[PDB]
């Protein structure tokens, strides 16, 4: 539910604080949280909307020119002056031209020639500012238990279906309670202000295409720029470089415009996020939110249910997810009522001993008409095992086999941890964050190292970093002093920063 | 313009060959069309401006 097939989901087990677990939410995947005796909840960050942005400094990327004019002077007079130089709509350039005795004045030095041309911009891109307030996150969460496989990617009614909830989170209301009927409520305390750097990212539009763009990239742009409120007649601070003033072989001047610039900016944009826009609001689909889950008002609906014993029919097959788990969809035949579903990963045929873990909380069918559908999943052992569902004489047993021993599992866990650290920085230390002292010390030292590293490096992209990494690798390899480690150590970071993304 | 006949062969843009009788056939089909990928569920196609 929500995350069976996400393929970027991770399991946060238990709550050694008894009440809460800290969790970082990301757009790519989702988090399935399973407690000791509480229903498993799958949580996913869905969209981040930004609202009422303020236009700032719109640029012009396609210029157009108009009626040129010019003026010349004697080799010994003043300087040329067109009366269209007192108009802030004309680009004007002054140079020296060969004059004399053929051209119209008796003297032979260099004259002075001024040429002016009217500037007009058909379209310009504009950037808008994003305050870290007035931006909203929308979290979708769902619960395991009674849902049939159909209700995995179906978002039509979550108001009344008792098992799914939607939570809106803004700086003005950073905490919420997701009410799940019969399950109680999951408290959710989040940090919206600090999720993703939204104090340096302008929103950029060119023509119905929108990006997230850093500052200092939307200020070091050499293009004619207005300064905010376009009101009447447009004014451009610089018509410079959108207009090229060449001159012929010392006896003319020529004004041309450079063409439309809209492909240079597309290439200049790299490492800038894609965003879309609905009305006045902008939807970003790549983000980073940190939420602590107060999971102390969650109950188990199935407790005090007499276990159903009619029959169980597989409906689709037992399937294996990407992470090792196993999903099963069962149909119940003879209606008893609301009742507990028996299921386990068993081994010895006589002493059905629960081996492995079941990650579907406790299954219970809530409908009794004739036949019902439900979906559960479970984490079977690495060896052969049996999926056993039923009570007596009708326990349809399936033979399951898992591939990879614990060693590969730990390797993959380390890989995921490394990737999450590379993506998030110090915040990665908060993913499973019940909270001790080793965790806080690690987070603090990571904060200091990340600040230093981002100050020194972190002005480069995948090639300068690979080059400097290899160079420092050789350097530390052959320096023979006591700094060797430092050099090599720095590269690890650098190198993984290049090979993990 | 006048262009060196080595700057006009290392150009990464869709190129025809010779004059066009009708609608041209362009061989590259890339370096102007970008197939970006959503977060593991979609594909989107954009053109560079």
């Amino acid at each position, epitope marked *: 539910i929500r995350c069976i097939g996400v393929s970027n989901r991770d399991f946060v087990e238990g709550m050694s604080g008894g009440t809460w677990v800290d969790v970082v939410l990301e757009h790519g995947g989702c988090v399935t949280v399973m407690a000791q005796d509480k229903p498993t909840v799958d949580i996913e960050l869905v969209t981040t909307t930004v609202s009422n942005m303020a236009e700032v400094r719109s640029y012009c990327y396609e210029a157009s020119i108009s009626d040129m004019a010019s003026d010349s002077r004697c080799p010994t007079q003043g300087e040329a002056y067109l009366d269209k130089q007192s108009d802030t709509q004309y680009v004007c350039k002054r140079t020296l031209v060969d004059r004399g005795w053929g051209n119209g004045c008796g003297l032979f030095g260099k004259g002075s020639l001024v040429t002016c041309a009217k500037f007009a911009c058909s379209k310009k891109m504009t950037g808008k500012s994003i305050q870290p307030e007035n931006l909203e996150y929308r979290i979708m969460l769902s619960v395991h238990g009674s849902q049939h496989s159909g209700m995995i990617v179906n978002d039509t009614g979550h108001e009344t279906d008792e098992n799914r909830a939607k939570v809106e989170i803004t700086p003005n209301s950073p905490r919420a309670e997701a009410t799940l009927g019969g399950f109680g409520s999951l408290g959710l305390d989040c940090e919206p202000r600090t999720g993703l750097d939204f104090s340096d990212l302008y929103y950029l539009t060119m023509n119905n295409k929108h990006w997230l763009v850093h500052k200092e990239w939307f200020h070091d742009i050499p293009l004619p720029w207005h300064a905010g409120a376009d009101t009447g007649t447009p004014h451009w601070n610089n018509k410079e470089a959108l207009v090229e003033f060449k001159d012929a072989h010392a006896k003319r001047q020529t004004v041309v415009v450079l063409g439309s610039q809209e492909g240079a900016v597309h290439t200049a944009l790299a490492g800038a996020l894609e965003a879309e826009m609905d009305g006045a609001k902008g939807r970003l689909s790549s983000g980073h939110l940190k939420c602590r889950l107060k999971m102390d008002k969650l109950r188990l609906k199935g407790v005090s249910y007499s276990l159903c014993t009619a029959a169980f029919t597989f409906t689709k*097959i037992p399937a294996e997810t990407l992470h090792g788990t196993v999903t099963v969809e069962v149909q119940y035949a003879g209606t008893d009522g609301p009742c507990k579903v028996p299921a386990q990963m068993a081994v010895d045929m006589q002493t059905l001993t629960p081996v492995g873990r079941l990650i579907t909380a406790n299954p219970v069918i809530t409908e009794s008409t004739e036949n019902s559908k439900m979906m559960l999943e479970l984490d079977p052992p690495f060896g052969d095992s049996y999926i056993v569902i039923g009570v007596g004489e009708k326990k349809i047993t399936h033979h399951w086999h898992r591939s990879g021993s614990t060693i590969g599992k730990a390797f993959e866990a380390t890989v995921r941890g490394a990737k999450r650290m590379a993506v998030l920085g110090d915040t990665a230390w908060d993913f499973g964050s019940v909270g001790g002292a080793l965790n806080s010390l690690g987070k603090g030292i990571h904060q200091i190292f990340g600040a230093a590293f981002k100050s020194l490096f972190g002005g480069m992209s995948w090639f300068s970093q690979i080059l400097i990494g290899t160079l420092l690798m050789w350097l530390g390899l052959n320096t023979k002093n006591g700094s060797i480690s430092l050099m090599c150590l720095a590269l690890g970071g650098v190198l993984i920063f290049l090979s993990t993304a | 313009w006048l262009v060196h006949k080595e700057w006009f062969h290392d150009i990464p843009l869709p190129w025809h060959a010779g004059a066009d009788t009708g609608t041209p056939h362009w061989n590259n089909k890339e370096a102007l069309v970008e197939f970006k990928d959503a977060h593991a569920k979609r594909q989107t196609v954009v053109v560079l401006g």
Partner: antibody
Amino acid sequence: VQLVESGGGLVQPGGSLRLSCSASGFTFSTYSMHWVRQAPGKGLEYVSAITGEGDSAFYADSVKGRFTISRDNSKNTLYFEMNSLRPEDTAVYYCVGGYSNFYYYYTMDVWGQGTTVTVSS
Amino acid sequence: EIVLTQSPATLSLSPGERATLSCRASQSISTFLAWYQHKPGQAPRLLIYDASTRATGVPARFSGSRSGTDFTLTISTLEPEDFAVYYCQQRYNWPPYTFGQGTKVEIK
């Protein structure tokens, strides 16, 4: 939640026509739309489809090339611009819609009343 | 393309009799099959999706079952408003979707 269809009528062979389907009562953008036609005395034929966002479109071989499906999420309207009509296209056309999270897939649908399109002969 | 074949072309039954319709796919559809009820002068009405799941408001008498490639729609107690044409539709991976040729449930 309803779909009201319009634009059916009489047309000459080789002629053209545009059918419209106005959606109400739901977030149109979250619904994949489909066109299914039924000739007189014939079974239903699934002919065309478009994703919720308009990104991509699908056409059955029986219509691929002549018919164009489109949608405007601001006007909440689905369109089936069918040109080069043939007498074999004389049928009742019904636009259907289903909440979609993946390009065309849907589980529970909603149907309009249908509109008759008659090739002249 | 996948094809759906409904076995009975036309079925004649008295009111209250059991009604059975079978739809066979040319290839595996694991759990994706829908059943629709279509009355003349009316839009086709969705009855069952995912083979055995009843649509919203569909009475409990309509039941769906699957076995490999053979799907079955069962009507236990026929009521007069049930005599119409019934279609099966494949909801497998791609939009290429085929509606069966349909079966007519008639009042013999």
